[PDB]
Structure formats: structure tokens, C-alpha cells
């Protein structure tokens, strides 16, 4: 009985440029499936026109993965001269008890490393400073370095928030409601990698593997320029 996100033309283009993964990395719905009215408990359109992702379990996901309209997977040069831009209007609800971190946007390499995760976190400690209930940027220091650089972007609000990721020429910037919160972070450690965007709900390290992470997107698009 779930309404499909494809019924809203504001999502037609990104869905044509996406495939849906759930509850792990396996695709459950390709672009043509998504455009043909795909809907389920973990991926549906709310009555007020949010595309809502929901998932439970450790490291489980309901996530769109960037695709080309050709059906090729997106695999752009992570540090190339072409600008790649993802924009999303996201409402992060108060998360259920036991939900501790939810990744909502990513730049992922074509193998096994997230270049960037934007995530909500219950708590984070960065160089001795503890922040509670914030939205975080995490940039991995390398493919062979499991550590990452972390930057608080925003105090969590239930309000619809505009996020923009701009990647170009080995730098990455993030704006939140129009304000730069990460200014040209270096990602040269992904020279020679290819990359793609992801958006949705990716549940990291829950303390209740039964609780549902839930994320709502009012707008979502990804583009490039030359
Ligand atoms: C890292 O995030 C991982 C996510 O949780 C998902 O599993 C994703 O699929 O892969 C991400 C990744 O590998 O980058 O998780 C590790 C971790 O949990 O061990 C983080 O490494 C720790 O980070 C903290 C910190 O920087 O605050 C350190 O205190 C700790 O010693 C580890 O370095 C990593 O930063 C990243 O979040």
C-alpha cells in the first residue's frame, strides 16, 4: 500500500540516475524498476512528498547509488577536473532508541572505501571535544588508512536542511543551508580512484539491531559540469 517516489516528477531524474540497494549492497531495484513505481516499507513516498528510507540492523542500508542514464554505473575520476555535485533537502527525524549513527550521503570509491560520509551521530569526540546530536562529515585518510578526518557540520534539527557536496580537482566542499561547513578538503588520497554518490539511510553501529533508522529527502539530485 506504499506510494512510489516515482509519482513525484521532482524525483524522476535522480531515479533514472540511480539504483536502490537494500538491505546490503545488492541492488533490489534498478532505474527502470524505480521509475515504474517501486515502493516498499524501506523506500516510499510520504503523504507530504518526502522520499523516505528506513532500515534496521547493523550496517544495513536503504540507499540510492548513482548511475548513468546509459545503465553504466557512475565511475567518475574522484580528483578530476569535472565538477561533480550532489544536492539534497533532507529531514532527519529524531532517531529511534538504539540508533547511533545514520549515514545519509556518501561519495564512495568504486571499490571498498567511502571517500566521504555525511552522517547523523548521537555522540562524537573530535580532538578532545564532544558533540552530541550533530551531523558530521567523515573523510577517509586513504584506502590503506582506516582512520578518517571528522568535521561537525550542523546541530541536528528535524527541519528540512539543504546539503550540497561539490567535488572537483582533488578538493571536496560541503555547504549546509547555503553556508560552507567544509571548505575544499583535500581528497588527493583518491587520485587514481573512481567515485560515485550515494544517498539514503545507512545504519552504522546501532546498539539495538531491531531499531529502524529513518531518513527523509524532499529533493535529491546529482550532476556534473565541464
Ligand atoms: C569508519 O566509518 C566506517 C563506517 O562505520 C562504515 O562501516 C563504512 O562502511 O566504513 C567506514 C569506514 O571504514 O571508514 O569507522 C571506523 C571505526 O568505527 O573504527 C572509524 O575509525 C575510528 O574512528 C574514530 C574517530 O576518528 O573518532 C577513532 O577514535 C578510532 O580510533 C578509529 O580510528 C572511521 O573514522 C570511520 O568512521
Find the residues whose C-beta lies inside 6 A of ligand 1.
Answer: 59, 114, 138, 140, 146-148, 150, 204
Q: How many CB atoms lie within 10 A of CB 123?
A: 11
Q: How many CB atoms lie within 10 A of CB 168?
A: 17
> Cell numbers at residue 93, please?
527525524
Between CA 209 and CA 131 the distance in angstroms is: 24
Residues sharing a CB contact under 8 Å with residue 217, sequence separation 6 or more, in sequence order: 50, 51, 52, 53, 88, 89, 90, 91, 199, 200
Between CA 71 and CA 99 the distance in angstroms is: 34
Let me know: does 14 contact 221? Beta carbons within 8 Å: yes
Between CA 193 and CA 219 the distance in angstroms is: 28
DSSP 3-state of 201:
strand
Place of cell 567535488: 167
Distance 116 CA to ligand 1 centre (A): 12
Between CA 83 and CA 79 the distance in angstroms is: 9
Q: Which of 217, 198, 163, 212 shows the shortest CA–CA distance to 44?
A: 217
Residues sharing a CB contact under 8 Å with residue 144, sequence separation 6 or more, in sequence order: none
* ω into 55 cis (within 30 of 0): no
Place of cell 527523509: 216
Residue 178 backbone zone (phi > 0: left; psi -120 to 50: alpha; other: beta): left
Residues sharing a CB contact under 8 Å with residue 119, sequence separation 6 or more, in sequence order: 101, 102, 103, 104, 135, 136, 138, 202, 204
Q: Whose CA is nearest to atom 21 of ligand 1?
A: 147
Between CA 146 and CA 155 the distance in angstroms is: 26
Q: Whose CA is nearest to atom 32 of ligand 1?
A: 147
Question: Which DSSP letter does residue 13 get?
Answer: H
Structure-determination technique: X-ray
Q: How many helices (H) and strands (E) does the chain have?
A: 2, 16
Distance 9 CA to ligand 1 centre (A): 37
DSSP 3-state of 142:
coil
Beta-strand (E) ranges in 46-190? 51-56, 61-66, 76-77, 83-91, 101-109, 114-126, 129-140, 148-155, 161-168, 171-176, 179-186
Resolution in A: 1.7
| CA dist list (Å): 213 to 17, 111, 145, 171 | 24, 25, 28, 30
Distance 113 CA to ligand 1 centre (A): 11
Run of H or E including 32: helix 31-35
Residues sharing a CB contact under 8 Å with residue 37, sequence separation 6 or more, in sequence order: 4, 6, 7
Amino acid at each position: 500500500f506504499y506510494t512510489a517516489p516515482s509519482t513525484e516528477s521532482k524525483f524522476t531524474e535522480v531515479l533514472s540516475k540511480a539504483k536502490l540497494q537494500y538491505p546490503t549492497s545488492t541492488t533490489v531495484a534498478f532505474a527502470d524498476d524505480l521509475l515504474d513505481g517501486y515502493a516498499a516499507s524501506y523506500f516510499y513516498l510520504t503523504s507530504d512528498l518526502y522520499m523516505q528510507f528506513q532500515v534496521a540492523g547493523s550496517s544495513q542500508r536503504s540507499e540510492l547509488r548513482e548511475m548513468e542514464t546509459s545503465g553504466d554505473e557512475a565511475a567518475w575520476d574522484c580528483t578530476g577536473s569535472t565538477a561533480h555535485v550532489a544536492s539534497a533537502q533532507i529531514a532527519i527525524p529524531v532517531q529511534e532508541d538504539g540508533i547511533e549513527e545514520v549515514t545519509i550521503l556518501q561519495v564512495h570509491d568504486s571499490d571498498v572505501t567511502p571517500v566521504l560520509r555525511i552522517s547523523w551521530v548521537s555522540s562524537i569526540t573530535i580532538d578532545g571535544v564532544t558533540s552530541e546530536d550533530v551531523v558530521l562529515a567523515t573523510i577517509r585518510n586513504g584506502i590503506d588508512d582506516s582512520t578518517a578526518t571528522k568535521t561537525v557540520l550542523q546541530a541536528h534539527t528535524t527541519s528540512r536542511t539543504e546539503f550540497n557536496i561539490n567535488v572537483q580537482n582533488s578538493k571536496l566542499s560541503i555547504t549546509v543551508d547555503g553556508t560552507t561547513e567544509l571548505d575544499e578538503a583535500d581528497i588527493s588520497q583518491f587520485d587514481g580512484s573512481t567515485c560515485y554518490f550515494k544517498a539514503g539511510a545507512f545504519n552504522n553501529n546501532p546498539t539495538d539491531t531491531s531499531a529502524n533508522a529513518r531518513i527523509k529527502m524532499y529533493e535529491l539530485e546529482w550532476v556534473d559540469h565541464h
